[model samples]
Target: SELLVNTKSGKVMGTRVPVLSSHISAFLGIPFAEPPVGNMRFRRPEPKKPWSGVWNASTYPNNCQQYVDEQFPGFSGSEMWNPNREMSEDCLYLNIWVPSPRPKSTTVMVWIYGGGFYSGSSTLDVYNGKYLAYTEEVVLVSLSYRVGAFGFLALHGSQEAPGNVGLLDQRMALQWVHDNIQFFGGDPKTVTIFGESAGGASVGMHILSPGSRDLFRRAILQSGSPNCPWASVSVAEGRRRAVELGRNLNCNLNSDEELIHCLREKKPQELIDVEWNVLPFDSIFRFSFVPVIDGEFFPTSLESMLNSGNFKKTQILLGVNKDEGSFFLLYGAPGFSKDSESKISREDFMSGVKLSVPHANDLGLDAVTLQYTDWMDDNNGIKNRDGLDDIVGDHNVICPLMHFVNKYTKFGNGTYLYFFNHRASNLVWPEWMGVIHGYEIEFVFGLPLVKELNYTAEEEALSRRIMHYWATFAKTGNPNEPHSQESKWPLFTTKEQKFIDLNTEPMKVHQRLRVQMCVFWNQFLPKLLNAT
Candidate 1:
């Protein structure tokens, strides 16, 4: 049987999604914006045209074009997470799952997937919202937007191919939801935008975007922020990348109009094949065609905007995994072999530090290396693999995140902090991988029928608790008020620096996460603003 609901654009027929004990009506692949194909490429997305009759939104649409198995031939992370869907340029769609036997208004959670801003989509199997809808009793939505050069090619001083069409795509999707989510038994006013990696950066960037300011009420950033080096680039660099892309695509660089037209005529795979020569060195974690300062979506650089406190005032829950850089380092950093047995040599580790923190001069690098040397070795050598992973994680994710959290808290908005240290029993990670990045998504979605990974009884309990916490936070800005039996999660303050440590046994509030190391990195991060 099909369930019909009338949206602002038209009527959509969705199929029932049945989980263990509950079911939800899923409206899949509903267009939020016009397809960015042909002449519509590289422009701000126009709202989806009104439909004449019933729209069958039962099947997931084509995901935005990306190089899944072709370009990134080195890493398993890319292959493991890529959305294997029909690729297309016309990929501006959003999926929704509304709880059945609807309540007055279920809190809505909009998920944005992370693929380093180059590749990701809402239709990925890992992002199945059925379990979330069933377990949390909340409305779930996932959206697909433009990515790679197709989405973020910045033509400075020109409005035709203005940067951040990807961001605009996301903003437009939010607008559609705000205007139509009520029809799906969701509260437009109570919305939480949450994502991991580049998706998390998207949530953070939206906080600073004036266009998306009024769209979301609260946010959850799993392991990314705009302050990260890969999050945004300089305007000059954006222009340079644009020109390089034009040359690669054999497009006319004489004018913006010609360039755009030539790009439109080019095949999607050709555009995807153009090697992005931006990042200094290759690593699974680094991104090339990411967000940039357009002087519109972002008035200035992310650091300046954040330092100025020019972001939305909303309740936020954010955290990083215990070892965010494990996957990248385990695969051997730039100068090392990809074999699992290969340990990070001192020379290779130094080269990685330089690549990861490019702006740091020899003196600065020396200071960083001095501060983060392997304690067990006592020779100041980064021979310890765990130590190397720690430094990499701290430099890339943890330190930047702390700065972000501290800045947000300074602005007087309620912010809850956490440290994800729980390693799921079913995860296929090296013992040293210690709760690697994106591991929480499995538990977050509460995926019940994953045949590859079996969840233990305790893991099931923890997933339920996490879903409850997230949903409760969306319903009311506080995640601990009605649910905390022990110690309530304290709001983050600069002085106290309290945070929850998520684990299977029992959760505890820890103070001053990575206090000494983060403090040192805080003093050093500004020097490496242009590091990547």
Candidate 2:
């Protein structure tokens, strides 16, 4: 059957997804905004204009321009996560997968990919949405937005590089979804936005954003939070970094206008060629270019927006894995392995502690070190490798995410939390690495359930359960709508601090995930940093 959907811009054609043919209809590479090229470079995105013909939506679109490092010592699938489609600054597209003969009042879930705010795309293989859409009977959507310098370079009082255009790109995509998803038989009001890593932080930022607040009603953040140290910086810091990037390009202009114009004039890829994190001890804690707290987009600091109790009261479901740090650790950090997974020495571990809390005093540093170091070993022979991972985990995902969750449950809406402890049976990384970051995503997106792929029966079963739970959350705001024999997931109140541990045959509930580490990183260490 011919499937053609109508958007404000024009009518578009869709194709049945492979393996799930005729069961699910997918429309890909639909532009949400006019191509941001030339004069549109760093400015806010304009909506796509009405076209004259039926737009073909069979092929994936160009991804946002970002650096792709092949041997970059990042994760096991470093190459896999790299951009599969061609790169271009003219990229501002979205994709949709809807169940054929769609259910009434269908829920929608939009995905945002993560590459530490530097690189990512919605077209990656693991991000395929056919299974989730077909199995859960929910409409699935994903979009690509500007990243790196093109997305985030800020110049004060300059309209061109107004800062956080990446987020502005996301807002534009959300607006498109709100306006156009109805054509695909989706309920625009029940849209749930979810992302991993930087995209998780992006979802949190959207939750706090003033201009983008009313677009989505629910959110899911995997392995990151807005409060993560590396996810953001102050406005002054954002502008300061932009200046650094400008000067590195020999754009030696006096005024912000001319300086930014110089930046826009250069070739796009060369802009990302400059060095990042040469600030002595900031390699681990600080990102090169990320979202900024400009007055218009963010309106205020992430903490302030969250604390105001005035944000949109949307339902929240978020979580992290056991070893979110390994993806980062397999590459660079002072006290850990580089391009390998070997154990670290005590001295190397201390270096990592200092890197984690570079601003802390001797007492605070000692306190943090003491918390992570295993005192149970009489010989003090702890490898300290896992200790460094805990530091990275707390700073990046657990502490910041729980901080948001706690604040939300305290003042905003209810939240259902999860901890993904499942390791694939055919994992490439060593067994000791635990369930590394981005692993749970394959199950979340239903990659294991593909008809052609031969994943284990247990993985497929677990994937179905996850799809059911997530779909239930989007539909009724309750993830406890479990099938028989599946445990009911508990609400993550600050009082009870309950969560579900997800995996095959171990779908059990747990309490106080990394509790002490969270207390230290969220509350105690910040006080120590201020004192020092």
Candidate 3:
């Protein structure tokens, strides 16, 4: 049966969602804008003209075309959502999972999927809102946006087009929530935007964007930060990559007019897959389809604003796993090996550090490098497999994330940081990938059905407890609320720099600064501020 829901605008939308089967009250999909395809591609999302008829939002819309088949080998959108999925130019649909027995005051959690600003959609099985809604008494929602060339091609003369359309799409999705969420038993006034990887980075950007200030009340950034992966690539560099991509596909565009139109003219799958044959590895950090710091929406460098305390008002929960870059290293990073000089060359180390973590001067780099090297020396030489993966992952991802968190706390916003030291003893990696990136997600979601060869029954329980704590946080601002054995997450005060260490036993640790490499990086930040 079709149930009619009323938006704040008094507009009525319809969807056929099942309730008797699960704890969820209903599931609804709402189309907020016309599909972003064809000539409409590369342009700002336009509002769908109000229609009189009831739209069938019972099911999710097709995901934006991406390289999911290659990256997530065993996963498919249809396997989870439904098999009758169809890709479209007008796919601005969003889904809502609500609790069956509705409460008077409910919070909303909107998820933004992470795929390096190129791939990923709202339809992933892992993002299913069923558990979040029915378990936490919160309205869970997600949406899809344009990715790859369609989302982030920052062409010249296209300055006003919200150069980062993916970002703008997120903003529009928030607007949709603002205008429509109350009908789904959600309190628009108390919404939290939380995500992992690129999703976390997007939340960081939203904190900086003038348009998103009032959209969300709080944020939880997992394994991603603002300044660390800022879209600092220049227009010329983007064009160079674009031309190279075009040359690969035999589509030449010497001028802006020709480039934008011709790029959009080709098939979406062809555009995403073309790079498969050309590039040795598939990573947008190496491709042209990345977020750009165009003048339209992102007027200033996010790093500066983050350092200056502008984002202090936005409560942030940021942390990276002990080992995050291992998979990217093993699968995506070229020439993966375990030999001594095989881990990370000195030049590659310096280059990646400089590219990701900007700092003040030479003292900063030396200080940071020494800090990391010292940790490994005390534990084990960076030669061993475990030591190699741990050190490289920490230097490349975790340490940079902490630097930003500390920078924000200096400005006054309360920052809560964590270190997930837990690792599966039975799993097989390249050698031993400890606490890798996105490793905790399935556990955080507590998908009862999923079981890896590495997971123990106890580990599965740990995952459930963690998921409950997170879902509780989405319903309330603080994750410190009571949940299983781990309750009351102590805040990370500047004086103490206390970090919650989660492993076999979750406990608190005081600031020791064993990772001197971070100190070096910090010393470098201010010098950069003065240098350029």
Candidate 4:
């Protein structure tokens, strides 16, 4: 079935999904901005101008340039996460899934894919929005943005090459949704932006960015926090790296203008080829160029921004998986990365901690060792990986996010949190990885509804319930309603911080996620890192 919809740019023809009984029009790969090529590169994205004829939106748009992790060895299928062919520089596009008949003004749920701000695409099969759109009766949208050097490259305070264009690309997509989603039966005012990992961090960035705050009313962040250690770098650091990149490319010219001129002349592939090698003792710096406070929107640190009441006062819902950091075991440690075959010993655990967080002395190391260590039985193989899992997971994912939420609730409109403790029955990674990072995407997007996978009855139930929770939250700014068909989720307050457990059929709410470890990383670890 072909359905024609109108956007600011032009008329778009969408393809109806075949799997669902009801009519769900999937309008894919609609360009929202002019392709930033040649002279347009590194500049803010401009809205796409009008086209003469109808645009075909039946297929996904081109993915922004990115680095494929050839080093990813554990799961043979994890390569699906990387950008496939059709990769290009002119990649500012969006996809939409509209329900058949629809509500008068349906709520809009917008998705931003996550790849540590380096690589991600909205076209991944697991991100298919037809089921979520049909089941939840909401319009769904996902957008693509530039990543890696193409998106973020700060040049010593030069306006010609300002960084953070990747985030700006996302903001431009949101503006397009605000202007055009109405034609797809979506309410521009009730838009809820959500993402995982880097996508989650992008949501947090939008929450705090003056440029993005007013575009959407609600946000759902899954495992990405603005305060994540790797989330951003200082503008000063960004400038240093740009010069470093220029050196790596053998283009470190005399002046900033000359340097940018030299850079703009190189092939885009040459620009992306300069990947950073990690320092032996460094855990704080992983990514070379990332989002930095540009002084315009992100005027200060996230904590300072919240304390000063400078960010958007929107309702927010966010959470993390039970073992988010275990995913990092692949690259966080050098020699002991193959965790399945090589069981991480106590020494490996200690080295993993240092690689996770480099400290002046082992005091910070001992502190982490003491806290994450399950003194109950330290040497047990399963128990050892659990502690190892908790260390990186706590530092990079859990603790940073907890710091944001704890500080956020005090200034935010309202907050709801959850902990995903369930895993799909059919997963390639070993069971020890547990509920790893981004594991909730399949469920949140209602993959179980498609019946492609042999999801257990319990798995199907969990996926459906989570979809319900996410959609309900988008609809009413709260995951629970008066009818109360599902578990009663509590609002997060400073004193009584509570969250839901997204585990099984009889789901329930819980009080703290990681009470002691969170305190250690968010408060104590920083203090230890700062000690002389």
Residue 167 lDDT in candidate 1: 91
Taken over the whole model, the C-alpha lDDT of each candidate is: 0.80, 0.82, 0.63, 0.82
lDDT of 3 by residue, 256-307 (tens): 6666667777887777776444332333133347677665566666666766
- TM agreement with the true structure for every prediction: 0.93, 0.94, 0.81, 0.95
The best candidate by TM-score is 4
**lDDT against true structure, model 2:** 0.82
**Worst-scoring 10-residue span by lDDT in model 4:** 277-286
1 or 2: which has the higher TM-score? 2
Query: What tens-digit string does per-residue lDDT give for candidate 2 at 8-43?
Result: 989999887754454678899999999998878888
Clash number for each model: 0, 0, 12, 0
What C-alpha lDDT, on a 0 to 100 scale, does residue 49 get in candidate 1?
Answer: 93
Per-residue lDDT, model 2, residue 244, is 79
- The candidate, 1 or 2, that scores higher on lDDT is 2
RMSD vs true structure, all candidates: 2.8, 2.3, 5.1, 2.2
Alpha-carbon runs more than 4 Å astray in model 1: 70-78, 280-284, 330-339, 375-383, 448-452, 481-487, 528-532
